[PDB]
């Protein structure tokens, strides 16, 4: 867990 | 979408039905084949549900009999039309019996109220419903001994080690936003997220402290309708008084 965030465009 | 009063009435009536007119049968048949692990996990889940309904005063019958009012099953409720005519779930259905999944049963139990020396600073109510009500608290003693302008910090994020877990949603940051305790019981919102934070429907400037007010709605996950998570802040006014009392 503690993954990298899914950035928006 | 029901009024609070309507939902309460819905609860009051069901509570009576559980205690007087309810006889529940748990389906023993499983549609998948599972290792004895997952099976003993679902068996533990069954026992929880049983205890929950017993607390509400409902009968638990061990047989699919003439009296059953609710059938609780693990199997697919939506694919009961595919089962054999001899199946208990098929017979219950075509006789208009109530058939619930485990998830539905647990939710029902939750709806019927089944499932330190530091004062309340504020109460956080999730109005989207993913999270139960939590209170932010702080020790009046520790707060008054701090000379810094920020007395305490609460972090909100996907990281379960944060002070407030926003849930596991990929679009949310491990540390999304913070709530800071200002000097006189004032509360500030600080967005440190990647995809942003909203306050009363307005995107706040990142890394900028914005004063919080009574009933202010904090929303994250905007952009994807099902990632949206709203938190309403209710600030405890007596906290300011226990702070002014202990000067």
Numbering used by the authors:
A (entry chain B): 1 to 9
B (entry chain A): 103 to 217, 231 to 362
Provide excerpts from the study:
Rad53, and its mammalian ortholog the checkpoint kinase 2 (Chk2), are key effector kinases of the DNA replication checkpoint. Rad53 contains two forkhead-associated (FHA) domains, as well as two SQ/TQ cluster domains (SCD), flanking its kinase domain. The phosphoepitope-binding site recognizes an epitope present in DDK24, whereas one of the lateral surfaces of FHA1 interacts with the modified BRCT domain of Dbf416, herein referred to as HBRCT domain due to the presence of an additional α-helix at the N-terminus of the domain. We generated chimeras expressing the HBRCT (Dbf4) and FHA1 (Rad53) domains in tandem and solved the crystal structures of these chimeras in the absence and presence of a phosphorylated epitope derived from Cdc7.
Since we have previously shown that a peptide derived from this motif of Cdc7 (pPEP, 480DGESpTDEDDVVS491) binds to the FHA1 domain of Rad53 in a phosphorylation-dependent manner in vitro, we used this peptide for subsequent crystallographic studies. Crystals of the ternary Rad53-Dbf4-Cdc7 complex grew in the P21 space group and diffracted X-rays beyond 2.3 Å resolution. Similar to other structures of FHA1 domains bound to phosphorylated peptides, pPEP is bound at one end of the FHA1 domain and interacts with residues in the β3/β4, β4/β5 and β6/β7 loops. The phosphate moiety of pThr484 is held in place through hydrogen bonds with Arg70, Ser85, Asn86 and Thr106; the pT + 3 aspartate residue (Asp487) is anchored through a salt bridge with Arg83; and the main chain of the intervening residues is further stabilized through hydrogen-bonds with the main chain carbonyl of Ser82 and the side chain of Asn107. The Dbf4:Rad53 interface is similar, but not identical, to the binary complex. Binding of the phosphopeptide, however, induces a small rigid body movement of Dbf4 around the two interfaces holding the complex. The HBRCT domain seesaws pushing helix α1 away from the FHA1 domain while pulling the α0/β1 loop towards the FHA1 domain. Upon binding to pPEP, the side-chain of Lys118 (interface I in Dbf4) comes close to the side-chains of Asp123 (Dbf4) and Asp149 (Rad53) stabilizing the interaction of the C-terminus of helix α0 in Dbf4 with Rad53. On the ternary complex, Lys200 (interface II in Dbf4) is not hydrogen-bonded to Asn112. Binding to pPEP pushes the α3/β4 loop of Dbf4 closer to the β10 strand where the new conformation of Lys200 is stabilized through hydrogen bonds with Gln126 and Asp128.
